[PDB]
From a paper:
Members of the cyclin-dependent protein kinase (CDK) family have diverse cellular roles that include regulation of the cell cycle and transcription and, in certain cell types, differentiation (Lim and Kaldis, 2013, Malumbres, 2014, Morgan, 2007). CDKs share a conserved protein kinase domain that comprises a smaller N-terminal lobe linked through a hinge to a larger C-terminal fold (Endicott et al., 2012). All CDKs require binding to a cognate cyclin partner to remould the kinase fold from an inactive conformation to one capable of phospho-transfer. We have used biophysical measurements and X-ray crystallography to investigate the ATP-competitive inhibitor binding properties of cyclin-free and cyclin-bound CDK1 and CDK2.
Crystals of the CDK1-Cks2 complex were grown in the presence of each inhibitor. However, only two of the resolved structures contained unambiguous density for bound inhibitor. The ethyl group pendant to the pyrazolo core is positioned up against F80, while the core is sandwiched between the two lobes through hydrophobic interactions with A31, V18, I10, V64, A145, and L135. The 2-hydroxyethyl group of the piperidine ring interacts with K33, which stabilizes D146 and potentially forms an intramolecular hydrogen bond with the pyrazolo core. Extending from the hinge toward the solvent-exposed selectivity surface, the Dinaciclib pyridine oxide group stacks up against the main chain of I10 through the face of the aromatic ring. Comparing the Dinaciclib-bound CDK1-Cks2 structure with that of apo CDK1-Cks2 we observe a slight, hydrophobicity-driven P loop movement toward the inhibitor, which results in a reduction of the active site volume, explaining the interactions we observe in the crystal structure. Dinaciclib proved to be the tightest binding inhibitor, with a measured Kd of 0.96 μM, while the binding of SU9516 did not reach saturation under these experimental conditions, implying a Kd greater than 20 μM.
Residue numbers in the entry:
A (entry chain B): 5 to 74
B (entry chain A): 1 to 157, 161 to 291
Amino acid sequence: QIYYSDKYFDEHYEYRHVMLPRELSKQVPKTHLMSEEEWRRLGVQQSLGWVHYMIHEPEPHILLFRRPLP
Amino acid sequence: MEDYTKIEKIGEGTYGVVYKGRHKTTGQVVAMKKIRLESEEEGVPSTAIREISLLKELRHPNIVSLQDVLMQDSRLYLIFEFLSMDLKKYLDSIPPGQYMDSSLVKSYLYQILQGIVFCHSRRVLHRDLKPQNLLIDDKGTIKLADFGLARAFGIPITHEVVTLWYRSPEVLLGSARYSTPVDIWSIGTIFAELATKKPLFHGDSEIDQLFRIFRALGTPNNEVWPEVESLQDYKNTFPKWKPGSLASHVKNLDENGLDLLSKMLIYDPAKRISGKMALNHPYFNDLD
Ligand SMILES: CCc1cnn2c(NCc3ccc[n+](O)c3)cc(N3CCCC[C@H]3CCO)nc12
């Protein structure tokens, strides 16, 4: 099933990423960044305020999320 | 080949299964590495077996000698000298709270560099150096295995997370070309792991590996690594860490050790130290 990395941090944001299994990633129609509604359809569960901010094209099944610090 | 008897299986590596074996004539205990060749298109030979011929001639104390190559149709055994242990397994076997004696670290790094310098001077790269690929005998000698095979087999195109930890940023960011500096990077990461017993950059994926590197070395940009902002997979939304931070990931290493390590881990492949230069580094002045 779905994997969740540990959180890591910038001076400005906190970040995590999430690894979709090959069945679930294969389904997604969207080739580009997603809204919170879209990534909630998929089963990703995080608190509110997490933003899908980039795609590493070599690994499209990895979803990279950021969220600003206080 | 009828000239060998397979004793037992010793593990699975990048190229497949490796057996302990015995040469029937001589009682020479050997390592036999089975590589599944594809059936090939009529009129279209691979240049694998010719690249293999070249490697078969290389002899150096710090590389594992390829003693023989046995062909079948669609199959190939590579025969090597046998060795008691691999470096992965040896580091696992050190009890928690013990480290490796810092003079054996030094000795091992030195020998590792001798092997690589010997290969680099013949335009042979390894490209996937890792503790599993470094083999020790009980007398203090360490040897490189699988040198040259990536060029020999390997294509322009899994679960090898382990393999990602020693990978260079030029490769991970999708640069068109790589060269000898990828092996010095690997050697960098392995040096840290000799000292600390654990991986320096313990990534779960390519992106995470990149992030683990940026965290320790700082997120690069054109100032530190010229033209990096043009590489295909550079994004200017990466997290922004500042030049590290690297000494904090590494214990059991002095001023000189840290100096050599940071030169092995320079971002710009064109400026990263070379194998020859690393062997002249003062970290090794108190070796022999
Ligand atoms: C070049 C072939 C060779 C020669 N010795 N050797 C060893 N010797 C150490 C050892 C390991 C376990 C049990 N015993 O008894 C001995 C290991 C090894 N490998 C370790 C991991 C599986 C593939 C492979 C890595 C790529 O060489 N490959 C080789």
